[PDB]
Amino acid sequence: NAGDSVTLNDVANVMYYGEAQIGDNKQKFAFIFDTGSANLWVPSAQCNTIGCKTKNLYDSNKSKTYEKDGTKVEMNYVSGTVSGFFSKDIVTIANLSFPYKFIEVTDTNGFEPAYTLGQFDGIVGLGWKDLSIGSVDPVVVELKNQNKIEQAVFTFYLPFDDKHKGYLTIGGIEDRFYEGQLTYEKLNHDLYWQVDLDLHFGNLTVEKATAIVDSGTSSITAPTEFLNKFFEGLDVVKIPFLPLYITTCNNPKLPTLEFRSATNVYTLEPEYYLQQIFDFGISLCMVSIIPVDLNKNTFILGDPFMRKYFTVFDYDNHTVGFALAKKKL
Amino acid sequence: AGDSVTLNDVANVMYYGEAQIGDNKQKFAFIFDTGSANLWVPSAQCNTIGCKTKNLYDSNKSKTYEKDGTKVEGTVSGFFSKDIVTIANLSFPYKFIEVTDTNGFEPAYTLGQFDGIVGLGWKDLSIGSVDPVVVELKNQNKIEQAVFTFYLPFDDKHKGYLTIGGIEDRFYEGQLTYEKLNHDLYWQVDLDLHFGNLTVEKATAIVDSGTSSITAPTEFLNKFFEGLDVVKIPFLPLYITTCNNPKLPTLEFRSATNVYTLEPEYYLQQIFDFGISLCMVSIIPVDLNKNTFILGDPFMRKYFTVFDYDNHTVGFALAKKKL
């Protein structure tokens, strides 16, 4: 149960990034690690677009272990659209080099404006394999298969705020990151890490909601209609044309969020979904609860929820685990 | 003698009006945009997330459709088409873009209540070298001068207007003041600028009905904002200050012969009010050519604007508060 960690750098509580490497010469890139998708991708040396103009581009010419593939591919998100092509090379994460098949991205035009605004180069998928010929095993599964970790498991620890680092630990669950006992839940489908829940948000309930636990979303997200009802009488103001929700930091009306599994209960107090945004004359916060319409009743438990709950993702037992993150390491 | 399209203002970020294409006279919502030079409508064969709630142009239904198909394309794509456009019951043969892919309009194509954009720029700004709609109309004897004007209502509770073919009394006070274009491209103009402590000689200023803000290059803007008590939201183009922030200076723009100003009250939009009153500042960073600034809606709300092809000028006057 010996773990292996990539340090995660926290920018303003909105995105967490870590470093990994590709190529025998070990080209460095910044990544979001995204439990929502399955591939590793990086912006290619031959990505022209404006977005790529600022990023670290992967150069195959300089890697003695590169191996052409050339298969064009296009994968999509909430985020949403991205295109390019498969390449094999040696990838290094935390300290483990392994041969992987990844995507060089040459088109990032439906990754705007998420991409340009961000200080990541590409994305490490920590999701589940596609049933397609021959999609790749996700990096953590591959590691297990190559016998480089003993368990196909990874955890997240995100620090309460700006002044401390976060951690993606691969291949072992480390006591240092939480208090009490992990609690575990069963998954319902295997596209991603999806959990069944009963939600109580202020006056609002939904029985049998499904929550994606997703490390690369910086908010709790919920269907528009339901979030519309959520905010009413809460004295939350939406900035027109922006996904931005502002309220007074000490708003006493703002409820503690409950999510109920079969046996368990997790709550999310205001303080974990509020980020101070302004401080002249009053303390003004953004609320990290935003509307995204996905499948029926589908909610995403992103960074705010994980800032409270250290979370374990076990491919091997098909479960997600939860416990109170330690306040200091 | 003008013809005006009514602009509806949503939240002060964008104004849209209606136009038509084709004999079956299909209707669409357009941004009327002096910072471009083509007409773009979404195509019936647009697929993307965005297009799926729009009014999509269907050549098949219009008997006056004439097929072009020339591929056009930073990151919006389609093909050219000919058909008759009607704007302000002025009807004309035109070459526009049917858009099939919407990602370059999409940091908020989906969020906006528009279908397309009618460009109001200069032919040399156009893809495909299209005479501008107002030029056509003057050539065709359909209006009286190649001239158009914008009146933007200083809030939601009022209609705005794009008037074509004439400069109308009803929109302004005092004299009109004119600047000659430094180039026939954008509606662009040499101004000396004075933003607080920063001055800049002979900057170029694009007068732009499709931008919702003033724009300045990045470094210059972040310097303008230092010590003003303005804060940026991580990760967005949003800047928030207290509404009666007394340190906010009036923008100043000078030509050889005229002076224009823009006080805080024109570049601030109220945003929060629980306890204290908070504002968003309609000045944002954009990097174009070296000393190029955009004078967007915040400026045009103070100043009624006149765009004149014949005399290669823009004119300015204080907009009537009440029509």
mmCIF file of C-alpha atoms in Angstrom, chain A residues 4-9 16-34 39-43 56-59 89-98 100 102 119-126 139-140 143 168 170:
data_model
loop_
_atom_site.group_PDB
_atom_site.id
_atom_site.type_symbol
_atom_site.label_atom_id
_atom_site.label_comp_id
_atom_site.label_asym_id
_atom_site.label_seq_id
_atom_site.Cartn_x
_atom_site.Cartn_y
_atom_site.Cartn_z
ATOM 1 C CA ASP A 4 3.292 7.681 -5.418
ATOM 2 C CA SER A 5 2.415 11.352 -5.630
ATOM 3 C CA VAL A 6 2.360 14.137 -8.162
ATOM 4 C CA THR A 7 2.337 17.486 -6.457
ATOM 5 C CA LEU A 8 -0.634 19.604 -7.404
ATOM 6 C CA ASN A 9 -0.383 23.346 -7.672
ATOM 7 C CA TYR A 16 -5.195 22.282 -9.741
ATOM 8 C CA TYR A 17 -2.339 21.279 -11.936
ATOM 9 C CA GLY A 18 0.560 18.914 -11.853
ATOM 10 C CA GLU A 19 3.591 18.144 -13.946
ATOM 11 C CA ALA A 20 4.290 15.065 -15.980
ATOM 12 C CA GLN A 21 6.814 14.151 -18.698
ATOM 13 C CA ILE A 22 6.913 12.658 -22.156
ATOM 14 C CA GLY A 23 9.933 11.432 -24.099
ATOM 15 C CA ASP A 24 13.271 9.967 -23.179
ATOM 16 C CA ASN A 25 14.586 13.557 -22.899
ATOM 17 C CA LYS A 26 11.606 14.073 -20.530
ATOM 18 C CA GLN A 27 9.719 17.076 -21.922
ATOM 19 C CA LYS A 28 7.770 18.713 -19.113
ATOM 20 C CA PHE A 29 4.098 19.770 -19.389
ATOM 21 C CA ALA A 30 1.419 20.990 -16.942
ATOM 22 C CA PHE A 31 -1.700 18.862 -16.680
ATOM 23 C CA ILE A 32 -5.135 18.831 -15.282
ATOM 24 C CA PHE A 33 -5.809 15.226 -14.129
ATOM 25 C CA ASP A 34 -9.452 14.589 -15.132
ATOM 26 C CA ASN A 39 -6.922 9.552 -22.625
ATOM 27 C CA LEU A 40 -3.773 11.461 -21.990
ATOM 28 C CA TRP A 41 -3.329 14.275 -24.449
ATOM 29 C CA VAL A 42 -0.805 17.008 -25.088
ATOM 30 C CA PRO A 43 -0.527 19.885 -27.481
ATOM 31 C CA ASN A 56 4.362 23.703 -23.957
ATOM 32 C CA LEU A 57 4.258 21.731 -27.264
ATOM 33 C CA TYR A 58 5.367 18.123 -27.429
ATOM 34 C CA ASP A 59 8.087 17.598 -29.992
ATOM 35 C CA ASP A 89 6.188 7.258 -26.457
ATOM 36 C CA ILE A 90 7.406 6.880 -22.894
ATOM 37 C CA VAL A 91 5.379 8.918 -20.333
ATOM 38 C CA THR A 92 6.548 9.711 -16.844
ATOM 39 C CA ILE A 93 4.253 10.365 -13.898
ATOM 40 C CA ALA A 94 5.216 10.812 -10.225
ATOM 41 C CA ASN A 95 8.377 8.746 -10.773
ATOM 42 C CA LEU A 96 7.331 6.025 -12.977
ATOM 43 C CA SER A 97 8.241 5.978 -16.681
ATOM 44 C CA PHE A 98 6.073 3.697 -18.834
ATOM 45 C CA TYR A 100 1.932 4.802 -23.364
ATOM 46 C CA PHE A 102 -1.488 9.194 -26.121
ATOM 47 C CA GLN A 119 -2.421 27.407 -17.085
ATOM 48 C CA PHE A 120 -2.370 23.765 -18.218
ATOM 49 C CA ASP A 121 -0.952 22.289 -21.405
ATOM 50 C CA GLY A 122 -2.892 19.035 -21.558
ATOM 51 C CA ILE A 123 -4.968 16.613 -19.550
ATOM 52 C CA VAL A 124 -4.302 13.228 -17.902
ATOM 53 C CA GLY A 125 -7.528 11.124 -18.100
ATOM 54 C CA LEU A 126 -8.264 9.274 -14.916
ATOM 55 C CA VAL A 139 -2.658 5.457 -17.091
ATOM 56 C CA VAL A 140 -3.363 3.992 -13.640
ATOM 57 C CA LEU A 143 0.704 1.081 -14.534
ATOM 58 C CA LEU A 168 -2.647 12.888 -6.734
ATOM 59 C CA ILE A 170 -1.139 6.622 -7.397
#
